[PDB]
Structure 1
């Protein structure tokens, strides 16, 4: 009996426990590509993932997270609109019950089948828990997934899902290279926003890549076999774990490309 994505506890209800849900810098948003402002002052992204150390994969009851060792500068994101160095701590996905929905951000109202979030925190704040309390604390790289050809670099994640089917299950997940999840181009949009699940803190610089990656129908089908529930509880399939677009309010979306 807490927040989730059901009819009785889903995104429309969250504001009752987390009033920041109606705040001024909430995410996700629709990216209107014609009113995004090209900003020549924006730098290319620098993704340095060569020394990434993955540790574990966890079903936390609303998604599955692949967690990384963030006790040193092993996998970091720099450049773009960021000042300073952000360390990778985990990635996860949001996805739908059908191929025509699943992403959190939309592009000219278009929904993708899923959205990948690579979550990084600003090393100047020392730990992730301190970082989420700051307006420049996190940087999340958002990558859209469309259904088409399979993504070979995603298959190791798909094959382990049977082992973490229910809430609270975890499995060792070492030597996974997140470089296999990136598109060819690193062109992006960026805007200031928030976590898209409770506690909905307004601490995120969003960097959303223009180029989607393709995954196969069989790959995304396997995401839809996970459960929101714990073992021994009534089965509820983990699907549609996305928050709908929020008002842009007083914000400008910037593009790194024209």
Structure 2
């Protein structure tokens, strides 16, 4: 027995094992576009993924992560509301059982079909494990996905899901360019938050892009064929692996545009 997204171990139950679930800077949150404040002080985001080295894709029971070599500054995020350099370590998605839900953050209560999270850690802390213990340890880039035209750069990811259908399975996944997943514009909102699944640490500086990226119904459908369970166990489709919006509390969402 452990946390998950079922009826008996879902988000509403997490607080019992992870008290921080009721913390002061929990994520995700609803972005009210009319209360977000434009901040001219915010610099443009600097995404340098030209030297990114993807290594593997794995199904960890609650999503699938596409891991990168973070032993050097190969793929980094700088600028924006960030101080210092943040290295990309992995990216994953959260999606729903229907196209009308799936994203974690919502914009004016609007839910998207899915949400892509590119996780980066602050190099000043040495390693990922140390970074999660700091208030400015991680910087996650969030991108919304809407159902429409297919996204060419995502197909490579879609085609390998068959090999990692169940929990614990992994597959070599080299030479994948994450630049194919970015929208045209880099305008964003940002606020201090946390990791949206246990252990829900409040070490995140969220940077959610305003412009969604379109994927076809066929591409999202393949996400829904994954399993939460391990091989040989009863099948339970991996869908609705998103946490609902949490109270904003004493936080301000800033926008890089107006």
TM-score interval, normalised by the smaller of the two chains: over 0.9
The Cα of 1:17 is off from its aligned counterpart by 0.1
Once the two structures are superposed, residues 150-176 of structure 1 have per-residue CA deviations (whole angstroms, 9 ceiling, x without a partner) of 000000000000000000000000000
CA offsets 1:110-152 (integer angstroms, 9 cap, x no match):
0000000000000000000000000000000000000000000
Instruction: Find the aligned partners of 1:126 and 1:175 in 2 and give their Cα distance.
Output: 25
Shift of 1:73: 0.1
Deviation digits for residues 29-74 of structure 1, max 9, x if unmatched?
0000000000000000000000000000000000000000000000
Structure 1 residue 249 displacement after superposition = 0.1
Q: 1:79 & 1:10 partners in 2: Cα distance?
A: 36
SS in structure 1 opposite 2:13? helix
Runs of 4+ that moved beyond 4 A: none
SS in 2 for 1:11: coil
- Across the aligned residues of Structure 1 and Structure 2, the Cα RMSD in angstroms comes to 0.1
| 3-state SS of paired residue (2:139) | strand
Equivalent-residue separation in structure 2 for 1:40 and 1:228 (angstroms): 43
Q: Deviations over 1:72-129 (max 9, x none)?
A: 0000000000000000000000000000000000000000000000000000000000
Could you report, residue by residue, the CA deviation over 1:10-39 in whole angstroms, capped at 9, with x for unpaired residues? 000000000000000000000000000000
1 CA distance for matches of 2:195 and 2:95? 16
Secondary structure in structure 2 of the residue aligned to 1:81: coil
Please report how far the alpha carbon of residue 252 of structure 1 lies from its aligned counterpart in structure 2 after TM superposition.
0.1
Relative to the length of structure 1, the TM-score reads: 1.00
Partners in 1 of 2:200 and 2:166 — Cα distance?
24
Any stretches of 5+ residues in structure 2 without a counterpart? Answer: none
Question: In structure 1, the residue corresponding to 2:67 is in which secondary structure?
Answer: strand
Task: Compute the displacement of 1:209 (Å).
Answer: 0.0
What is the distance in 2 between the residues matched to 1:139 and 1:148? Answer: 28
Whole-Å Cα distance in 1 between the matches of residues 4 and 63 of structure 2? Answer: 11
Superposition map of 1:198-209 within 5 A: 198-209=198-209
Alignment partner, residue 4 of structure 1: 4
Instruction: Give the deviation of 1:180 after TM superposition.
Output: 0.1
- How many residues align? The count is 258
Instruction: Tell me which residue corresponds to 1:54.
Output: 54
User: How far off its partner does 1:193 sit?
Assistant: 0.1
**In 2, distance between residues paired with 1:66 and 1:43?**
28
Q: Tell me the residue number matched to 2:26.
A: 26
User: Aligned partners of 1:179 and 1:25: how far apart in 2?
Assistant: 30
Question: Normalising by the residue count of structure 2, what TM-score does the alignment of the two structures yield?
Answer: 1.00
Structure 1: gaps spanning 5 or more residues: none
Cα distance in 2 between the residues matched to 1:21 and 1:138: 18
